[PDB]
Coordinates of C-alpha atoms in Angstrom, one line a residue:
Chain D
X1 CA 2.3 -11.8 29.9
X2 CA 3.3 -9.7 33.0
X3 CA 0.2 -8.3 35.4
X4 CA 1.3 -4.7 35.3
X5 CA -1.5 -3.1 37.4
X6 CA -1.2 -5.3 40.7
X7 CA -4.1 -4.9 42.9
X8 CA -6.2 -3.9 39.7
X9 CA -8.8 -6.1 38.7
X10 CA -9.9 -7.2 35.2
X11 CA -13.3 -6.3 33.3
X12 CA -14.8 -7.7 30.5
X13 CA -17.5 -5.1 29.3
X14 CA -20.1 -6.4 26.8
X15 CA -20.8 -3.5 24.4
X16 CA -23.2 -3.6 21.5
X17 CA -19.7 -4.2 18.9
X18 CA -17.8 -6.2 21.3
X19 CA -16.0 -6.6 24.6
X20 CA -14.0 -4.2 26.0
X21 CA -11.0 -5.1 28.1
X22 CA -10.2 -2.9 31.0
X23 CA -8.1 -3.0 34.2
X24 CA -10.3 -1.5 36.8
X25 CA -8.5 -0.2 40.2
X26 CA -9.1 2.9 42.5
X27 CA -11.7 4.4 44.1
X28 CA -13.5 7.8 43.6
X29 CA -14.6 9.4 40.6
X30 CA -14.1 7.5 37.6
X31 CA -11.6 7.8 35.5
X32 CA -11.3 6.4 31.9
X33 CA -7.4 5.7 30.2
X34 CA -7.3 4.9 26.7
X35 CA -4.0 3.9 25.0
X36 CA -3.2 4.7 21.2
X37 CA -1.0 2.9 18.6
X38 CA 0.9 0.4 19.0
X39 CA 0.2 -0.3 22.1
X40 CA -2.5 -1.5 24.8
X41 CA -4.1 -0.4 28.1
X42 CA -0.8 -1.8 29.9
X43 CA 0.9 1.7 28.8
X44 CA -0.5 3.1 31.7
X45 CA 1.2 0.6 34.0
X46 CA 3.1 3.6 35.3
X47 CA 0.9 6.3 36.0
X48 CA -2.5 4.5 36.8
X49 CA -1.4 3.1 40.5
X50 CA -1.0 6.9 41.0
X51 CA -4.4 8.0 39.9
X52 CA -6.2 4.9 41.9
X53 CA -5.6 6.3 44.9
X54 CA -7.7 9.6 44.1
X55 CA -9.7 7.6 41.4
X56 CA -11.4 4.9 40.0
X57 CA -8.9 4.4 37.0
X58 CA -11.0 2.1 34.1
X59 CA -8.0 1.2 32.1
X60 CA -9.5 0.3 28.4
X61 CA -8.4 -1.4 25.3
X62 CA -9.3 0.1 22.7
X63 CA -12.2 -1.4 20.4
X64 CA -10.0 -3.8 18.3
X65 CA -7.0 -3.3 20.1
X66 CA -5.1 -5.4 23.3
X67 CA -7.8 -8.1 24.6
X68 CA -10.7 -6.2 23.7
X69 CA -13.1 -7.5 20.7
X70 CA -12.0 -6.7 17.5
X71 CA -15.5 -5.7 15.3
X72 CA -15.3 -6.4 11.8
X73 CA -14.9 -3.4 9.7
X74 CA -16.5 -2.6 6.6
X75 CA -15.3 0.1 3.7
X76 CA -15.8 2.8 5.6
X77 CA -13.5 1.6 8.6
X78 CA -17.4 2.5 10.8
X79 CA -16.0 0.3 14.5
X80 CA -12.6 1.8 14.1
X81 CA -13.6 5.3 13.6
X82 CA -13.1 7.4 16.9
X83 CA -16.8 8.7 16.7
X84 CA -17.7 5.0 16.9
X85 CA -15.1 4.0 19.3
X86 CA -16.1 6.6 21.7
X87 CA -19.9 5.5 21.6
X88 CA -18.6 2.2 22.4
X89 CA -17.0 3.1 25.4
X90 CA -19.9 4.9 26.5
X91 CA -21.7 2.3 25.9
X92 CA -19.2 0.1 28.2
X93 CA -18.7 3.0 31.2
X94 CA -22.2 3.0 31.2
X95 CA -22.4 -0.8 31.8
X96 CA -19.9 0.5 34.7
X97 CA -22.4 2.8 36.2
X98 CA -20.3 5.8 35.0
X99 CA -22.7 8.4 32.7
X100 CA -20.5 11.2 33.5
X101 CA -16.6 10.2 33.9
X102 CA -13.2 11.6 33.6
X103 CA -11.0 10.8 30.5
X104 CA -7.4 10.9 29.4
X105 CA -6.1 9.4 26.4
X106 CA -2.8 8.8 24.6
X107 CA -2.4 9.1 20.7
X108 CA -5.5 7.1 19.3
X109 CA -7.3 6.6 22.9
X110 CA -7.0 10.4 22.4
X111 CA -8.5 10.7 19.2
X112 CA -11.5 8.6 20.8
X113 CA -11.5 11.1 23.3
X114 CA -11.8 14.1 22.4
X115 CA -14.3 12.7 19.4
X116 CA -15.6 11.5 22.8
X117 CA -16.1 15.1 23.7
X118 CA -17.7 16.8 20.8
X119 CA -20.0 14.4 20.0
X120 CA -21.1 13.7 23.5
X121 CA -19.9 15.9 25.8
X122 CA -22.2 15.8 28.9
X123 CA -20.4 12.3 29.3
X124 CA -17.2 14.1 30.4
X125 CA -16.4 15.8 33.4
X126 CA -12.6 16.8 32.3
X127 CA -11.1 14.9 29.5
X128 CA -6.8 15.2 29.1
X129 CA -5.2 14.4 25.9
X130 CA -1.6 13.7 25.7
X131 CA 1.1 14.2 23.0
X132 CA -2.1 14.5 20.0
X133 CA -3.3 17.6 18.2
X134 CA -6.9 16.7 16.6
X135 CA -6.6 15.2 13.4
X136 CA -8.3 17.3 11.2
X137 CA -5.4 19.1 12.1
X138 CA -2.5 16.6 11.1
X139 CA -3.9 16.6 8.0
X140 CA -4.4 19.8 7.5
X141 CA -0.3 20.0 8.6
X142 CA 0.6 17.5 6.1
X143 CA 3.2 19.2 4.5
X144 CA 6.5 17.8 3.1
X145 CA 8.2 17.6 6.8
X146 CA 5.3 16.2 8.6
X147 CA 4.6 13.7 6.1
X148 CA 7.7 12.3 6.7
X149 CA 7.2 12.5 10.1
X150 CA 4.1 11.0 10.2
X151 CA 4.5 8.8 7.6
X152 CA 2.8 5.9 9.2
X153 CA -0.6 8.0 9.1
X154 CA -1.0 7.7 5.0
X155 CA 1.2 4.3 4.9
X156 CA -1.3 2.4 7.3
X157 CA -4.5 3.8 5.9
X158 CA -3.3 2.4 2.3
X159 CA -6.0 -0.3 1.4
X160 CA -6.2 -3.5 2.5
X161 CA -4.2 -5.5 2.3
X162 CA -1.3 -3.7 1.9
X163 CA -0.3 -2.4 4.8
X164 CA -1.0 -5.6 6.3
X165 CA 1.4 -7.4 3.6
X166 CA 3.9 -5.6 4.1
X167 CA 3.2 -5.5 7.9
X168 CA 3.4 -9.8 8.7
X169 CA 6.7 -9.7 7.1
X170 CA 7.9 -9.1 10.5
X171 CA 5.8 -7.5 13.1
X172 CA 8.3 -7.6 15.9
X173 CA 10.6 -5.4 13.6
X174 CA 7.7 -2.8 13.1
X175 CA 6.2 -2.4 16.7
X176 CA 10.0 -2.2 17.9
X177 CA 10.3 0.3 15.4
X178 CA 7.1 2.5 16.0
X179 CA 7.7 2.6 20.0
X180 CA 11.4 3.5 19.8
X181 CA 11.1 6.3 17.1
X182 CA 8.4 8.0 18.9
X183 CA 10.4 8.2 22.3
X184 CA 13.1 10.9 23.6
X185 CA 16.0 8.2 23.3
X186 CA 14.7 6.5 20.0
X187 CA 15.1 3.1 21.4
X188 CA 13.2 1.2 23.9
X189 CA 14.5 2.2 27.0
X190 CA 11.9 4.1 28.5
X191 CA 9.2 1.1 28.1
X192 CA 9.2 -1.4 30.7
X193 CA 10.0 -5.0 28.8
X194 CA 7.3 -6.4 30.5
X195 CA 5.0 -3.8 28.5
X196 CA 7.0 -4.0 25.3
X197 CA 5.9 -7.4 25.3
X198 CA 2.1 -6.6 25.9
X199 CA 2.6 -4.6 23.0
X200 CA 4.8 -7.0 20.7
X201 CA 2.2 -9.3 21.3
X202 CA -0.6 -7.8 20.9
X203 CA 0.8 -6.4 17.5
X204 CA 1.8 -10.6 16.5
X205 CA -2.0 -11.0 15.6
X206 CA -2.9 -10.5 12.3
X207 CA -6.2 -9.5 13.4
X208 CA -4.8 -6.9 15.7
X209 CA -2.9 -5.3 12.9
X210 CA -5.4 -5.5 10.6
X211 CA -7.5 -3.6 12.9
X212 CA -4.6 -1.1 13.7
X213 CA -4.8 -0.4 9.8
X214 CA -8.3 -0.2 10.0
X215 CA -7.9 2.5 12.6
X216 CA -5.4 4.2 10.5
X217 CA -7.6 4.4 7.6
X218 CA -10.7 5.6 9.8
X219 CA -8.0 8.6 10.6
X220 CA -7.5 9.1 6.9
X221 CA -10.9 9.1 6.4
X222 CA -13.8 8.9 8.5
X223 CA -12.5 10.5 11.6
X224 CA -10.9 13.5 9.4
X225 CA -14.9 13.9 7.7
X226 CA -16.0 14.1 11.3
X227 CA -13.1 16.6 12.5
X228 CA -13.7 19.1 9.7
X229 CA -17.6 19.1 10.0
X230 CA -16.9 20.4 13.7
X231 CA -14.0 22.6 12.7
X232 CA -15.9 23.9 10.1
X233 CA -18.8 24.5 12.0
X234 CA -17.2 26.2 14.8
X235 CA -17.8 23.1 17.5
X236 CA -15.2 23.8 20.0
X237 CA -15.2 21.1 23.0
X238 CA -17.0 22.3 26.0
X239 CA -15.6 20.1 28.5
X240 CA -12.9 21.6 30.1
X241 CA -9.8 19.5 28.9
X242 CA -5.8 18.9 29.6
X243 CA -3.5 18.6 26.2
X244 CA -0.2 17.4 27.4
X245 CA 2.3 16.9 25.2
X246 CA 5.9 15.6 24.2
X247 CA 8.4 18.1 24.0
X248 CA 9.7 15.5 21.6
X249 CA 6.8 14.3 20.4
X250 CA 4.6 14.1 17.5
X251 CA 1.9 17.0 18.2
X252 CA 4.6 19.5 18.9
X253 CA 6.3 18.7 15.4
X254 CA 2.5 20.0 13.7
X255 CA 2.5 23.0 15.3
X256 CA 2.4 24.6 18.8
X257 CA -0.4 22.5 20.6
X258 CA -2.0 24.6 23.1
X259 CA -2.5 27.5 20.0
X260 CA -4.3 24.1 18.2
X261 CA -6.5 22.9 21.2
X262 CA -7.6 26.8 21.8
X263 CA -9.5 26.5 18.1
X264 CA -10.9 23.0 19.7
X265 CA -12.0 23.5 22.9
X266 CA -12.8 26.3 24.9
X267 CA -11.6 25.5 28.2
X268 CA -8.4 24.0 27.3
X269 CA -5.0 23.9 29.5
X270 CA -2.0 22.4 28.3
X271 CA 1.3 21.5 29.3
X272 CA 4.6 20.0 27.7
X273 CA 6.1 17.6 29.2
X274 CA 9.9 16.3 28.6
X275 CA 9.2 13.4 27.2
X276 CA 9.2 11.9 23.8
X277 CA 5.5 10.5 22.3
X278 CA 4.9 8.2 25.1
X279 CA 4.2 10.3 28.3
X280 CA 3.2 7.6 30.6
X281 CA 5.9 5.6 30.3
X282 CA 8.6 8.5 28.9
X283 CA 7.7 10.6 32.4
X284 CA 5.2 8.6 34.2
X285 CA 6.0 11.0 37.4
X286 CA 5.3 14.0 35.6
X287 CA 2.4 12.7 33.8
X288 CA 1.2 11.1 36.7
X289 CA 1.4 14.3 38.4
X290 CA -0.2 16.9 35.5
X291 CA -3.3 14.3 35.4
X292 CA -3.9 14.2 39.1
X293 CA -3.4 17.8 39.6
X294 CA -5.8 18.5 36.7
X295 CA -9.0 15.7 37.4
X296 CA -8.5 16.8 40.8
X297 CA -9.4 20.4 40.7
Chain G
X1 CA 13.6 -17.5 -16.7
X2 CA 13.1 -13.7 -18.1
X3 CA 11.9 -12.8 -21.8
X4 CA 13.7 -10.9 -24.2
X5 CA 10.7 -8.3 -25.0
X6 CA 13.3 -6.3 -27.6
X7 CA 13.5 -8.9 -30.1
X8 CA 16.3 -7.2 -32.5
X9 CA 17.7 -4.8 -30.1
X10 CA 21.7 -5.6 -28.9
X11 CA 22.1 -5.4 -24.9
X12 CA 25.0 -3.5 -23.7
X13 CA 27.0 -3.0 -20.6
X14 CA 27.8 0.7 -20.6
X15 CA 30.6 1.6 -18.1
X16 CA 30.6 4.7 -16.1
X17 CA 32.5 6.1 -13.4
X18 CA 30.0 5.1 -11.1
X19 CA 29.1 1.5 -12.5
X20 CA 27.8 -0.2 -15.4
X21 CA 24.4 1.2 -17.1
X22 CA 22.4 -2.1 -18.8
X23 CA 20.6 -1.0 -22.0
X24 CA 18.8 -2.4 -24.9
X25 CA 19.9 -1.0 -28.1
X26 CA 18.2 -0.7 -31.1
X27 CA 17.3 1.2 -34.2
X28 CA 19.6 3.8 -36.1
X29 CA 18.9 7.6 -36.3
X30 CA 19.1 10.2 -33.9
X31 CA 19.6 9.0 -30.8
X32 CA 17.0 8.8 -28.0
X33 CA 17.2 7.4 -24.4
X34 CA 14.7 6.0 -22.9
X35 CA 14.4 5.8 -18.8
X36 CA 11.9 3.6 -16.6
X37 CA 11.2 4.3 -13.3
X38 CA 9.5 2.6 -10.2
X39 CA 9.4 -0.1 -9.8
X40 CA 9.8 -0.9 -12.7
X41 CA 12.9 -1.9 -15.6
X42 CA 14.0 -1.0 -18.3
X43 CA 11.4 -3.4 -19.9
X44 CA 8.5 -1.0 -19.7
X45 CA 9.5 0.2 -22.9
X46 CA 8.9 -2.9 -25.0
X47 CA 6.1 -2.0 -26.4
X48 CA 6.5 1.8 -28.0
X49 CA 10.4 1.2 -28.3
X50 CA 10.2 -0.8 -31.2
X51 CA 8.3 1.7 -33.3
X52 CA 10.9 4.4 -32.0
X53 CA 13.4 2.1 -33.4
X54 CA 12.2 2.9 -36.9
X55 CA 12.9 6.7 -36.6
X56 CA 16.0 6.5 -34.0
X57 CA 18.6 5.3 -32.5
X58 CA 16.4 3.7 -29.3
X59 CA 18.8 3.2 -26.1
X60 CA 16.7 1.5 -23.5
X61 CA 18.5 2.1 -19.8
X62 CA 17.8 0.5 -16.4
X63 CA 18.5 3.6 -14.3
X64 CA 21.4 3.6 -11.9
X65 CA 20.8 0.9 -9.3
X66 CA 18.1 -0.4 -11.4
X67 CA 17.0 -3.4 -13.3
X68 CA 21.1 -4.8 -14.6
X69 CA 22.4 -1.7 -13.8
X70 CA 24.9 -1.6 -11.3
X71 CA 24.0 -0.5 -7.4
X72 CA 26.9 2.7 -6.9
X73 CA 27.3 2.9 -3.1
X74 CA 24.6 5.0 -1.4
X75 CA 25.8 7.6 1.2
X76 CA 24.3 9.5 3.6
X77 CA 22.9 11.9 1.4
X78 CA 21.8 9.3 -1.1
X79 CA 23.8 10.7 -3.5
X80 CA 24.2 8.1 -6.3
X81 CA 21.1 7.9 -6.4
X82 CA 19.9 12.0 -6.6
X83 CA 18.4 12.8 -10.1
X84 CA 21.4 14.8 -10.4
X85 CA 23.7 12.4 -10.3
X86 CA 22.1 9.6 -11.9
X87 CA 21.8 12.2 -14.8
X88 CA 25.1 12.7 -14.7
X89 CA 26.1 9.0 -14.8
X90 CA 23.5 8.4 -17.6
X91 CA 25.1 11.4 -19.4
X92 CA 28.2 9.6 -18.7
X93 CA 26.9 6.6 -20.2
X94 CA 25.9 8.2 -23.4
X95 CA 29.0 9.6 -23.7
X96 CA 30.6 6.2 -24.0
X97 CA 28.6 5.7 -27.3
X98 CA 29.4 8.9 -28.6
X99 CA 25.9 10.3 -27.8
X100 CA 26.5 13.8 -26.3
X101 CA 23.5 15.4 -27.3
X102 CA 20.2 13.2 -27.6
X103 CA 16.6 12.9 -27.2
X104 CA 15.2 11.6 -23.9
X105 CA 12.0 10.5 -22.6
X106 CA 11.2 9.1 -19.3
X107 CA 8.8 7.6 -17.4
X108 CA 8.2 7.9 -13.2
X109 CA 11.7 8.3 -11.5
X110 CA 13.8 8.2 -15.0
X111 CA 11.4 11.2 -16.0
X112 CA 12.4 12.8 -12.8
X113 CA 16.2 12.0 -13.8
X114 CA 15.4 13.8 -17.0
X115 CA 13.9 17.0 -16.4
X116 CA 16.9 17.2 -14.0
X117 CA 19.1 16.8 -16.6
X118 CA 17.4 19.1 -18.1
X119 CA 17.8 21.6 -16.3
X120 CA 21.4 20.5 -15.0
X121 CA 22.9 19.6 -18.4
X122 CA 19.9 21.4 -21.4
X123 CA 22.6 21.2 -24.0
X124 CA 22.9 17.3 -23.8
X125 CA 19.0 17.4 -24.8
X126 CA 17.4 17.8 -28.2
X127 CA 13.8 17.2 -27.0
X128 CA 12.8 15.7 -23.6
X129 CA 9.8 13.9 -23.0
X130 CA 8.1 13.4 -19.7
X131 CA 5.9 11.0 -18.8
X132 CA 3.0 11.2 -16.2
X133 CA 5.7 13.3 -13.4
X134 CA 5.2 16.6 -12.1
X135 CA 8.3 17.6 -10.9
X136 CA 9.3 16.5 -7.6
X137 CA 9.7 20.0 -6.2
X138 CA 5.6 20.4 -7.0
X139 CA 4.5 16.9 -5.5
X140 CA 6.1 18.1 -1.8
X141 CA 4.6 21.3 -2.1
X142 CA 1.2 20.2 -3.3
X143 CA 1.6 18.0 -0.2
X144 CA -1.5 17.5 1.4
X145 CA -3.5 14.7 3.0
X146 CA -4.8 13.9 -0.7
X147 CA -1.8 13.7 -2.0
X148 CA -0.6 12.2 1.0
X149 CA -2.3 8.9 0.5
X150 CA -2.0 8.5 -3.2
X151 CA 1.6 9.3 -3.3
X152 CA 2.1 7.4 0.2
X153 CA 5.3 5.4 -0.7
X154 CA 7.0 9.1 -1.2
X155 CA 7.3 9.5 2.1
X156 CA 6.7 5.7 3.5
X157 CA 10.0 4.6 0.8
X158 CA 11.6 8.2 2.0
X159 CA 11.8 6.2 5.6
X160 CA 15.5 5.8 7.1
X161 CA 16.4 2.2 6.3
X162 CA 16.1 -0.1 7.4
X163 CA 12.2 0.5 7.7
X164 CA 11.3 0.4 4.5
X165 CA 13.5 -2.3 3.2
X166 CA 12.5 -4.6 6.2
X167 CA 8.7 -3.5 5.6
X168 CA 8.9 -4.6 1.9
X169 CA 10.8 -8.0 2.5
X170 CA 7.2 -8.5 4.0
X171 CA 6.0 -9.3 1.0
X172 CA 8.0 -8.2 -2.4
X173 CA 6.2 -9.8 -4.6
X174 CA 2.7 -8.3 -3.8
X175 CA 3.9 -4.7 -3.2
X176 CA 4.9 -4.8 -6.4
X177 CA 2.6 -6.4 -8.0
X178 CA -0.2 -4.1 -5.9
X179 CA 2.0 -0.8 -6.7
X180 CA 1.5 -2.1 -10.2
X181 CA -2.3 -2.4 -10.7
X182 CA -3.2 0.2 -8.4
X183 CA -1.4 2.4 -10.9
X184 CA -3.2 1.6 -13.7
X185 CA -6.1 2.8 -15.2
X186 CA -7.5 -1.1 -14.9
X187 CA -6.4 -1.3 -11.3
X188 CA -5.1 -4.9 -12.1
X189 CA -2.1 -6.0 -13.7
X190 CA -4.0 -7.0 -17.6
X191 CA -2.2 -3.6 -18.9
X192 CA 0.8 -5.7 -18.5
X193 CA 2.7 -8.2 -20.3
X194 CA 3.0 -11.2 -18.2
X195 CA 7.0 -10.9 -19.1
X196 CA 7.6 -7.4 -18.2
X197 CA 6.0 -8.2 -15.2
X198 CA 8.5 -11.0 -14.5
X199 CA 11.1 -8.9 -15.1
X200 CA 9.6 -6.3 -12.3
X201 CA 9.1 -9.1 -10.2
X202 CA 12.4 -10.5 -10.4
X203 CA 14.5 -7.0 -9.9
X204 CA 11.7 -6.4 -7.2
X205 CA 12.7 -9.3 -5.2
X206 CA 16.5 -8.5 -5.0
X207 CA 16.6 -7.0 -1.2
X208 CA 19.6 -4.8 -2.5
X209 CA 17.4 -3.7 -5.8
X210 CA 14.9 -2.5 -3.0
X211 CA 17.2 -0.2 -0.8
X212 CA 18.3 1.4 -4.1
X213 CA 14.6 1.8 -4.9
X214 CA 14.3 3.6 -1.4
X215 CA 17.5 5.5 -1.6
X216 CA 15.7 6.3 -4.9
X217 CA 13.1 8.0 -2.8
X218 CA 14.8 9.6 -0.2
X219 CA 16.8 11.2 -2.7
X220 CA 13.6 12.4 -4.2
X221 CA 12.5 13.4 -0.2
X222 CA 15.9 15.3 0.1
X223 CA 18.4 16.5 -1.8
X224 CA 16.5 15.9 -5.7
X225 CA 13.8 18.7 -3.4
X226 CA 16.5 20.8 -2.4
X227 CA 18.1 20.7 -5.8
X228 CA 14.7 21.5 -6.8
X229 CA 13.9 24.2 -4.9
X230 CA 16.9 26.1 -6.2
X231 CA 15.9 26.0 -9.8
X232 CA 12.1 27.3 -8.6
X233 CA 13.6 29.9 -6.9
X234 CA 16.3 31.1 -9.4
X235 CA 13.5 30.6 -11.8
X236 CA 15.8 28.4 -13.6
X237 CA 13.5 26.9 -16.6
X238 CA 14.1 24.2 -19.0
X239 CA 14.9 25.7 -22.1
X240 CA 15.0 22.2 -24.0
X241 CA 11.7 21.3 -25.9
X242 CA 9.7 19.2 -23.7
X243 CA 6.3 17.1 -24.5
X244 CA 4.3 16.1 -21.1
X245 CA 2.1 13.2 -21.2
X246 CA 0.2 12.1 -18.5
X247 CA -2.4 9.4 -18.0
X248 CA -5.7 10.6 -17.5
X249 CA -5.8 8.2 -14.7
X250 CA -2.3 8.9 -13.7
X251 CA -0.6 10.3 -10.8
X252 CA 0.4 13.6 -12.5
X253 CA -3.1 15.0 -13.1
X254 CA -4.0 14.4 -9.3
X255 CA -2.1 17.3 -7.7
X256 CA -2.6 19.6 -10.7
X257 CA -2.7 20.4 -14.4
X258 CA 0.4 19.1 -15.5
X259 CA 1.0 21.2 -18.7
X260 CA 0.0 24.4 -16.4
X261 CA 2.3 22.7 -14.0
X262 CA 5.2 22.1 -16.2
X263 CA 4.7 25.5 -18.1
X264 CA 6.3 27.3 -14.8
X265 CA 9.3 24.5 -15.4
X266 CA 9.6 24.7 -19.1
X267 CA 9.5 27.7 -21.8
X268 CA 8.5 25.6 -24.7
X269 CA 6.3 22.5 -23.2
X270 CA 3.3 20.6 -24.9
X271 CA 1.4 18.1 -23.1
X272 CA -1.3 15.9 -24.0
X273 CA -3.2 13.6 -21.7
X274 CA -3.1 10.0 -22.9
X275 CA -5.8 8.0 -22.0
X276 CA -4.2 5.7 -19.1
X277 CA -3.4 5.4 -16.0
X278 CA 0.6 5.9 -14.7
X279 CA 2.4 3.4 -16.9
X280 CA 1.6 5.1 -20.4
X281 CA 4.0 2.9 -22.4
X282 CA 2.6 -0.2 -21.2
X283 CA -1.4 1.1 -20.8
X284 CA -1.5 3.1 -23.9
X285 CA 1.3 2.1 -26.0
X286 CA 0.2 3.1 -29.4
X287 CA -0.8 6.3 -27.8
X288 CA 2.1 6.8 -26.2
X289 CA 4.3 5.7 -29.1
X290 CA 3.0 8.0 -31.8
X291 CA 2.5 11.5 -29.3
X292 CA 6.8 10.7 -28.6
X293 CA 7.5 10.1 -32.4
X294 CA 5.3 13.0 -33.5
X295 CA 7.3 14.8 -31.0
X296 CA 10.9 13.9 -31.2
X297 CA 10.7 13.6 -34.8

């Protein structure tokens, strides 16, 4: 598997459920990356040399996901649940030094971030998500159209062990699948091959997908619970925050994203971006560019 | 290799313009089609078709594409495999036995083919029976994260191929076998006969018997919704006399009251709830058997 980040080192960061992997470069304020589904901390192989040189870029697996320890679930999905991922990761910056850190995150990593941001808030100087809309909110789009769209949201939350089943038939086929469909083109030409591999193996482990399913039905569940208590209760996300999305992605299919992230979060910019799903690798420059300009002032 | 579970019924090859309909044939009287649906055969009638064999003439159909029936070409559009047009190749079929106006019941997808051809075709129908369906129109619009995750495979199946078909090559056999027992009110597969699951099995591991299953279902995502659609809004109703069942435990009563439902489809419906989950014939067969003869005779 390729080094992506050269000149980045490598963590391991013991948590209280599990190790979390992270490439570590930079210098300055910290920054956290989180990836989403299906892929790993490498999709930021194209925008984090840019933020090292104005920040200490932490870029994190996942709980369960990439290299980092995969927790065992239980029937309520607890480790993979974004309120549970996020405390993890606090737990791990904090092993870092960093109580108070910058955050972006991409499509689950972004679900754990801005969970990240409700339920903990003073741990977050500026958090960006990219190409999400909360997901209370997905399912409160789920419609006809979107849940074709999203199909893969009430698909991989099935039970066990369905998903999975169906999933081992052929995992190449079905991470192939998930990171062309989601991209401008609809193939894999954006993605560098060295990532798509990071990813294609990361999604060959059983374990890894079982997790990824896991995650999935934390979404269905769990994290939606969790989403409508603060929706319900009027929390909005304090820390001023970035939503960057795909012109062509999934957020922007839900509904208009910046309209969503102003019920969210009251100090909320947001941006598209020409790009399909995967903004970092899609339009690393302009990502690159919108998350340097935004942690930096 | 595969039981005959209609001891005394003939087997016929019934040609249509769009391929040959298999049936199981038994019983004199007035006659009265019966129509599986997913993923099943027409097997799932072995155990109430014998006692509508005393009253009528009991034709038991694999659907187009289904079971021994032939696989018509799919298209873009799915068309073949529209309600509307396998009601119109299964009116077809009963044409070629002289059967232009009969009784129909039908269970799943073949229920969805017969309140279309209900609604296409009312004068080919003395009664119609439907069997744990809302219509399809109402299962899109009630779409909503609930619904989203117990009706999954409507929009995972609706999936441009070849995700679905590659997805379920995964593991044939368990999906469905798991689609199944979740179905039922047991949740495991002792509702069944061992044979009819065989049979289920068997047409379920046929990789071209799948696509039809999810050209089945994108039909039902696209054009059986449209065609839908324009009966709800030209408040086109069945006038043909209709009895809904629905299993208790079934998907029907999930997204809402199915006689209330089916009352804004139908000017002269009665429904009864039979205790069961989704495959009433097989779960509740004396049940089932006696609420369609008390009906349709």
């Amino acid at each position: 598997l390729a080094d992506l980040f050269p000149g980045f080192g490598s963590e391991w960061i013991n948590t209280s459920s599990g190790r979390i992997f992270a490439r570590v470069g930079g210098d300055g304020p910290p920054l956290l990356l989180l990836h989403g589904f299906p892929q790993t901390h490498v999709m930021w192989h194209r925008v984090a040399p840019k933020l090292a040189e104005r920040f200490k870029v932490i870029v994190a697996d996942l709980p369960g996901y990439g290299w980092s320890d995969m927790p065992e679930s239980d029937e309520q999905h607890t480790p993979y649940t974004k309120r549970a991922m996020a405390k993890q990761l606090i737990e791990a910056m904090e092993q870092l030094g960093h109580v108070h850190f910058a955050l972006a995150g991409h499509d689950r990593g972004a679900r754990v971030s801005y969970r990240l941001a409700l339920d903990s808030p003073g741990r977050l100087s500026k958090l960006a998500v990219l190409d999400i809309l909360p997901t209370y909110e997905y399912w409160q789009r789920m419609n006809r159209a979107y849940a074709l769209k999203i199909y893969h949201w009430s698909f991989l939350a099935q039970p066990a062990p369905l998903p999975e089943n169906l999933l081992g038939g052929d995992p190449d086929f079905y991470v192939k699948a998930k990171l062309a469909s989601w991209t401008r083109a609809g193939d894999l030409s954006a993605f560098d091959p060295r990532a798509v591999e990071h990813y294609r193996i990361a999604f060959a482990d059983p374990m890894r997908r079982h997790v990824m399913c896991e995650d999935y039905r934390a979404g269905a569940y769990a994290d939606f619970e969790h989403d409508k208590i603060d929706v319900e209760a009027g929390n909005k996300i304090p820390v001023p925050m970035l939503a960057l999305w795909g012109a062509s992605g999934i957020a922007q299919s839900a509904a208009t994203p910046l309209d969503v992230w102003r019920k969210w979060a009251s100090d909320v910019q947001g941006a598209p971006i020409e790009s399909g799903h995967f903004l970092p690798e899609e339009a690393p420059d302009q990502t690159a560019e919108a998350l340097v300009r935004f942690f930096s002032a």
